[PDB]
């Protein structure tokens, strides 16, 4: 061949993960954002002035 390319186009890879580094990128970023979300769930709900019980939720 003449030059080098990823050669992943049109190959049906899961999520386009040609190399494992892409897997780490998606997993690490998601875990971080979920991590900061996880520690804030109680505060976010407290504003509702209601407990997140079985009756909690915008309902009509």
């Amino acid at each position: 061949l003449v030059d080098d390319r990823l050669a992943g186009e049109g190959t049906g890879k899961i999520l386009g993960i040609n190399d494992p580094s892409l897997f780490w990128a998606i997993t690490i970023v998601f875990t971080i954002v979920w991590g900061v979300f996880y520690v804030s769930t109680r505060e976010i709900d407290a504003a509702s002035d209601r407990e997140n019980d079985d009756d909690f939720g915008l309902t009509l």
Partner: protein, 221 residues
């Protein structure tokens, strides 16, 4: 939810005719499972609770530590001398010794006795401090011997006592799962001879074909 008489129990709807009287629900991880009566003695129950959490904390480190090098060697560019956990000890007898992350410039240990001498000194001191309840110059005096907190909780994740009770259940439940999985790591290593990560990918390739019963059950007797 996790404490008191209405706690979840290990036999689900049938766990009422065998929950011991002494298992009341004042400690994390209490599902009422003492069918052998090994904790009938209140003092022995106290020590067993310490051993369980210590065995659990080691297993949580063990489970992550036994598979993290294998995950890195397979799904990253890191090239360990021996990623598989039950072959990692023999790395120190190799020509280059044991190189952390495969890099000759990291650790580069080459004598097993020097590593062992350092370990029995470092672990010996640390285990003594935990056993005695106080470190050098009374570092941890007056702190709980199982849940010291203080210096061991730099992020203060357990300052709220109610959050502590919830998080203790998380520690023992993750720890019990790690202990059980380390039993799997031991037996799967013996039966399969492959790394635990290699075993998982084998199940995923064809679960009906690559499992214990279709590969190894006939050989164990």
């Amino acid at each position: 939810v996790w404490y008191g008489p209405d706690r979840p129990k290990f036999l689900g709807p049938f766990s009422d005719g065998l929950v011991p009287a002494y298992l009341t629900g004042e400690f994390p991880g209490d599902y009422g499972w003492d069918t052998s009566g090994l904790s009938a003695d209140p003092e022995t129950f106290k020590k067993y609770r310490t051993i369980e959490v210590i065995h659990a904390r080691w297993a949580m480190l063990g489970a992550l530590g036994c598979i993290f090098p294998e995950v890195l060697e397979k799904y990253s560019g890191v090239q360990f001398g021996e990623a598989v956990w039950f072959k990692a000890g023999a790395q120190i007898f190799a020509d280059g010794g044991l190189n952390y992350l495969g890099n000759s410039g990291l650790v580069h240990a080459q004598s097993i006795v020097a590593t062992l001498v350092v370990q029995v000194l470092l672990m010996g001191a640390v285990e003594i401090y935990r056993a005695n309840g106080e470190g050098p110059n009374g570092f941890g005096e007056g702190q709980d011997t199982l849940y010291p907190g203080g210096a061991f909780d730099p992020l203060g994740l357990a300052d709220d006592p109610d959050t502590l009770a919830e998080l203790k259940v998380k520690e023992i439940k993750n720890g019990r799962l790690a202990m059980l999985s380390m039993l799997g790591f031991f037996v799967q290593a013996i039966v399969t001879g492959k790394g635990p990560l290699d075993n998982l990918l084998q199940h995923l390739e064809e679960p009906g074909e690559f499992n214990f019963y279709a590969l190894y059950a006939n050989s164990l007797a």
